[PDB]
Amino acid sequence: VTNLCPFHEVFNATRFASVYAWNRTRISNCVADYSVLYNFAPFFAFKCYGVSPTKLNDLCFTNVYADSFVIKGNEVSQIAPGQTGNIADYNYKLPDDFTGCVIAWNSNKLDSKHSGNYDYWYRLFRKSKLKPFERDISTEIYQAGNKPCKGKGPNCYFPLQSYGFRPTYGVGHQPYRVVVLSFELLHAPATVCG
Amino acid sequence: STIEEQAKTFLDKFNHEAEDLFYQSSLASWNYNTNITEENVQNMNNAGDKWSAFLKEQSTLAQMYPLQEIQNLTVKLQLQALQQNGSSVLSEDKSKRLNTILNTMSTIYSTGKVCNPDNPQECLLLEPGLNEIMANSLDYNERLWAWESWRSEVGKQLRPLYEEYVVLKNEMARANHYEDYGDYWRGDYEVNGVDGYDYSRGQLIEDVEHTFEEIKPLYEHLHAYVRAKLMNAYPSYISPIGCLPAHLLGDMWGRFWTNLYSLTVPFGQKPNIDVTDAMVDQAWDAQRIFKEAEKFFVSVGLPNMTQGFWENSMLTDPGNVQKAVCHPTAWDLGKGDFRILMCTKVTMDDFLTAHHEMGHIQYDMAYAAQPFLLRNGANEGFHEAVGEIMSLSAATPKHLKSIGLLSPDFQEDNETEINFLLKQALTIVGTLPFTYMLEKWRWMVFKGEIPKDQWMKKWWEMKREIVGVVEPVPHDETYCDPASLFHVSNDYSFIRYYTRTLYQFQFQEALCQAAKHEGPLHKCDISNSTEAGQKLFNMLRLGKSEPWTLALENVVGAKNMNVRPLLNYFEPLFTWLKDQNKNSFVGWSTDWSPYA
Ligand SMILES: *[C@@H]1O[C@H](CO)[C@@H](O[C@@H]2O[C@H](CO)[C@@H](O[C@@H]3O[C@H](CO[C@H]4O[C@H](CO)[C@@H](O)[C@H](O)[C@@H]4O)[C@@H](O)[C@H](O[C@H]4O[C@H](CO)[C@@H](O)[C@H](O)[C@@H]4O)[C@@H]3O)[C@H](O)[C@H]2NC(C)=O)[C@H](O)[C@H]1NC(C)=O
Ligand SMILES: *[C@@H]1O[C@H](CO)[C@@H](O[C@@H]2O[C@H](CO)[C@@H](O[C@@H]3O[C@H](CO)[C@@H](O)[C@H](O)[C@@H]3O)[C@H](O)[C@H]2NC(C)=O)[C@H](O)[C@H]1NC(C)=O
Ligand SMILES: *[C@@H]1O[C@H](CO)[C@@H](O[C@@H]2O[C@H](CO)[C@@H](O)[C@H](O)[C@H]2NC(C)=O)[C@H](O)[C@H]1NC(C)=O
Ligand SMILES: *[C@@H]1O[C@H](CO)[C@@H](O[C@@H]2O[C@H](CO)[C@@H](O)[C@H](O)[C@H]2NC(C)=O)[C@H](O)[C@H]1NC(C)=O
Ligand SMILES: *[C@@H]1O[C@H](CO)[C@@H](O)[C@H](O)[C@H]1NC(C)=O
Numbered sequence: 020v021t022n023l024c025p026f027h028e029v030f031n032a033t034r035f036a037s038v039y040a041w042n043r044t045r046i047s048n049c050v051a052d053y054s055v056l057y058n059f060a061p062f063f064a065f066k067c068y069g070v071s072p073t074k075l076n077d078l079c080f081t082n083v084y085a086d087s088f089v090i091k092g093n094e095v096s097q098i099a100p101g102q103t104g105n106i107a108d109y110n111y112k113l114p115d116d117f118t119g120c121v122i123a124w125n126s127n128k129l130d131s132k133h134s135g136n137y138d139y140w141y142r143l144f145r146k147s148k149l150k151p152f153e154r155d156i157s158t159e160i161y162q163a164g165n166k167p168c169k170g171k172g173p174n175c176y177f178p179l180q181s182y183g184f185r186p187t188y189g190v191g192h193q194p195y196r197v198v199v200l201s202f203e204l205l206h207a208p209a210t211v212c213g
Numbered sequence: 214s215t216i217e218e219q220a221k222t223f224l225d226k227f228n229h230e231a232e233d234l235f236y237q238s239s240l241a242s243w244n245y246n247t248n249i250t251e252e253n254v255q256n257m258n259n260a261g262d263k264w265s266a267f268l269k270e271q272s273t274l275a276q277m278y279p280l281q282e283i284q285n286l287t288v289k290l291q292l293q294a295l296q297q298n299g300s301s302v303l304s305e306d307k308s309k310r311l312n313t314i315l316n317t318m319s320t321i322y323s324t325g326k327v328c329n330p331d332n333p334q335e336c337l338l339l340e341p342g343l344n345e346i347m348a349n350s351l352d353y354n355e356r357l358w359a360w361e362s363w364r365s366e367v368g369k370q371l372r373p374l375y376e377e378y379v380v381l382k383n384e385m386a387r388a389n390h391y392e393d394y395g396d397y398w399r400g401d402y403e404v405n406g407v408d409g410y411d412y413s414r415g416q417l418i419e420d421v422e423h424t425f426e427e428i429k430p431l432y433e434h435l436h437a438y439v440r441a442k443l444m445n446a447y448p449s450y451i452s453p454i455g456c457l458p459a460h461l462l463g464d465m466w467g468r469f470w471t472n473l474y475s476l477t478v479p480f481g482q483k484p485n486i487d488v489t490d491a492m493v494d495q496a497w498d499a500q501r502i503f504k505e506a507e508k509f510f511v512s513v514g515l516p517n518m519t520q521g522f523w524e525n526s527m528l529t530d531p532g533n534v535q536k537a538v539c540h541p542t543a544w545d546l547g548k549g550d551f552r553i554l555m556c557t558k559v560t561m562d563d564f565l566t567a568h569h570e571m572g573h574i575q576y577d578m579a580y581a582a583q584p585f586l587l588r589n590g591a592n593e594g595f596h597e598a599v600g601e602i603m604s605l606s607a608a609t610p611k612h613l614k615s616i617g618l619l620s621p622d623f624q625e626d627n628e629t630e631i632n633f634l635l636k637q638a639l640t641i642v643g644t645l646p647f648t649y650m651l652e653k654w655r656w657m658v659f660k661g662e663i664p665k666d667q668w669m670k671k672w673w674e675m676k677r678e679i680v681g682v683v684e685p686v687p688h689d690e691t692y693c694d695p696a697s698l699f700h701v702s703n704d705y706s707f708i709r710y711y712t713r714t715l716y717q718f719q720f721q722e723a724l725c726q727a728a729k730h731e732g733p734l735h736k737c738d739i740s741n742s743t744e745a746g747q748k749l750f751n752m753l754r755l756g757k758s759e760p761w762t763l764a765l766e767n768v769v770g771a772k773n774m775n776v777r778p779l780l781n782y783f784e785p786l787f788t789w790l791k792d793q794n795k796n797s798f799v800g801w802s803t804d805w806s807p808y809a
């Protein structure tokens with residue numbers, strides 16, 4: 020036991036990222052221990068699809084990707100393979116044969132302001148659905164009419180719509196922090212387990 | 214691409230913006246209501262102005278999509294609601310004049326007071342002392358003086374204001390496509406575009422009249438009974454066959470006959486069902502009352518309250534410098550926020566009021582999934598009936614015995630049931646003719662069939678015709694009697710109560726039948742049954758998406774109002790009243806007048 024994979028940086032990072040511009044991390048060439056995840060607060064959802072949660076230390080991989088963002092409480096069910104919805108097909112799409120685990124826990128105390136937290140945005144309009152593991156950052160005036168826009172106005176909207184968080188909101192609208200781990204095989208030495 | 218999608222995108226954006234703005238406004242209003250300070254008033258005014266302006270510009274933008282190219286039958290309702298409730302057509306000067314008139318009327322009504330004769334030091338107000346004097350004082354002259362003084366002091370000032378107000382309202386309504394402002398109110402029940410469920414504005418009036426024709430006997434019998442009892446109280450003044458004087462109805466206007474229970478009790482020897490002493494002995498408090506109400510609501514299968522409800526709601530009077538209004542209200546601030554405001558005492562009335570408010574809260578919580586513009590009751594009467602049936606079913610001896618407040622040795626018989634039925638009838642049955650007459654007169658004056666110089670005349674004629682009440686002192690056209698009422702002066706519709714009074718009984722009979730209860734209807738409890746709760750929840754979750762006729766058919770299997778459940782409920786009292794009125798004349802003659 021020499022090198023420990025950093026799981027104290029993905030989790031416990033003060034501020035996360037907007038869902039429409041989610042963050043990606045690469046973990047490799049270290050001994051990964053999954054017992055540190057259970058040291059946190061109870062999780063709203065702990066679902067593992069491709070592998071059993073208990074047998075995570077018996078098989079291992081070559082690369083592990085950690086994706087983190089913040090969404091509403093009732094949109095957690097949309098982070099799953101074969102799901103349809105706004106946030107599912109416009110911001111973050113998962114393949115049907117996805118193998119990994121999804122973590123989500125309440126973060127009301129850290130991501131709420133009395134005046135309002137307007138520092139989280141999500142995409143509301145798009146011309147076409149998103150391919151799996153694709154991101155879109157360009158912000159152009161979305162057109163919904165035959166006439167060209169040439170500026171924001173009627174029938175032409177700003178694609179991004181902002182959240183607003185207050186501590187007095189009920190559960191189901193309060194912020195939730197989500198971490199998605201991914202595993203894969205490829206023709207290369209694994210070197211990531213322990 | 215097409216008009217429908219262009220409208221759908223706009224609706225999608227409006228749905229997310231309006232929720233945040235409405236939440237800000239509601240939070241400001243709540244913060245002011247629970248805590249009265251000048252800064253709270255300023256914040257409330259700012260939030261209201263922002264919300265009104267935003268609705269104005271959104272309604273202005275909504276005109277781009279014509280309504281004849283949409284067949285989805287759900288987007289159309291949202292667009293129609295936006296256009297209806299955000300449009301302005303009058304000129305700026307006329308709008309300013311109307312706002313000034315409304316504010317002047319509200320201020321005059323709120324600050325109205327009467328000063329004691331030969332004692333200018335003390336001037337009585339309406340809420341603190343006038344209502345108490347009307348309810349409790351047994352002096353004929355004192356009651357007559359208070360009635361006449363209030364009518365003169367709040368009617369003479371508001372008559373020209375009401376004339377200008379009705380002229381402006383008729384002008385605004387005719388500016389729109391409606392015939393007049395009364396049509397504008399009656400349009401709330403209009404349903405179009407669905408086969409087998411269409412409802413026109415002109416139908417409603419007929420329905421109302423028909424229902425009244427089916428309820429005239431019972432009421433008049435009750436009226437006769439009360440008259441006899443009042444003849445036993447004041448022997449000289451009341452004519453044997455004349456109409457009752459207006460100032461002896463137990464309140465200012467005669468809306469309710471509840472205050473007459475003490476004088477007209479059928480059997481005073483029998484003990485009354487009271488649980489205040491039992492609650493005091495068992496050391497109850499507000500939290501226990503609300504927990505019991507929550508348990509009752511759980512017993513039918515409906516979901517119970519959230520943590521935020523308990524943490525944020527206030528259930529006791531703060532006291533000290535903290536001043537707040539103690540009128541019980543149910544707040545739906547949005548974004549999953551529900552609260553109740555009520556200054557609670559350890560009394561049976563508060564025990565029932567807790568259930569009444571939790572019913573409203575449950576109905577608000579039911580349709581949270583619907584779009585923003587459809588999160589409302591089917592019409593203006595469904596919400597009231599849904600709130601009232603819960604209090605209807607929670608005041609039965611069986612429920613109290615199950616809870617444990619009532620002694621198990623208590624038993625029911627003839628006189629207890631008769632007293633309970635008369636107590637309920639003095640509150641429910643009495644207000645229907647008053648409400649019907651007021652709405653009919655207001656519709657007539659909006660139509661223009663009554664010229665101004667005859668207004669009061671016609672009004673008093675109807676008082677002698679329908680309600681059977683005669684004025685104590687003749688009044689000329691200088692007075693404005695109807696404007697004294699709170700709803701009349703503050704521009705509120707007055708037909709929701711009439712529809713609620715029937716919807717509640719229809720719902721109660723349907724739910725009791727679903728629970729397979731046996732026996733008299735007035736002794737029915739649905740605490741443990743789940744089929745009734747399931748049917749009620751199925752109705753509640755709809756929201757405004759479906760027409761009210763379809764929801765009523767889904768619940769009770771009928772497409773219109775019916776008075777049969779009410780008569781079935783009140784039949785045991787009706788038979789006793791018919792038996793008792795054998796030696797008393799039934800009916801009144803309008804020719805008799807107290808002032809010769
Ligand atoms: C479209 O625009 C219209 C305005 O034209 C909006 O209509 C309002 O709708 C609401 C909800 O239906 C109405 O609210 C109701 O007001 C009644 C009037 O009460 C007055 O008097 C009491 C004192 O007696 C005051 O406390 C109160 O503040 C009012 O000044 C209330 O009596 C009603 O309360 C009922 O429900 C509560 C629970 O919510 C129960 O606890 C009560 O016991 C009671 O059963 C109710 O609050 C409001 O009056 C309407 N406005 C007008 C001008 O009529 C629409 O909302 C809007 N549509 C939108 C925005 O979509
Ligand atoms: C009138 O327009 C409304 C608004 O679009 C239509 O409601 C829509 O109905 C479809 C099909 O029932 C809904 O699609 C569903 O989406 C969920 C994901 O949210 C998915 O899991 C389901 O399998 C289904 O595909 C759609 O959400 C719904 N729209 C809204 C805003 O709720 C309605 O069908 C239209 N009616 C007519 C007669 O055209
Ligand atoms: C009731 O309202 C008053 C004023 O509207 C509140 O007093 C303010 O409280 C905030 C935070 O507590 C202070 O920042 C302000 O300076 C106070 N204003 C004044 C004029 O003193 C009061 O806190 C409210 N009551 C409660 C229980 O919150
Ligand atoms: C609904 O269910 C409750 C729960 O069993 C019943 O409450 C019982 O009531 C009887 C009196 O009839 C008491 O002797 C029991 O102790 C109560 N049990 C509990 C657990 O509180 C209630 O009676 C039922 N409703 C009706 C109408 O019978
Ligand atoms: C992150 O962890 C550090 C130390 O482990 C702690 O001091 C800090 O409060 C944590 N912050 C959050 C948001 O969990």
Ligand SMILES: *[C@@H]1O[C@H](CO)[C@@H](O)[C@H](O)[C@H]1NC(C)=O
Binds near residue numbers: 035036037042
């Ligand atoms: C994304 O992750 C990188 C790598 O840790 C970090 O430097 C950056 O601050 C993150 N950005 C956001 C918006 O979280």
Ligand SMILES: *[C@@H]1O[C@H](CO)[C@@H](O)[C@H](O)[C@H]1NC(C)=O
Binds near residue numbers: 515518
């Ligand atoms: C009622 O509230 C309690 C909390 O005291 C909760 O445990 C219970 O699940 C709620 N009822 C239902 C039907 O969920």
Ligand SMILES: *[C@@H]1O[C@H](CO)[C@@H](O)[C@H](O)[C@H]1NC(C)=O
Binds near residue numbers: 627628
């Ligand atoms: C009183 O109850 C008895 C029960 O035997 C019944 O015969 C009688 O008609 C009742 N009388 C009244 C006035 O309710």
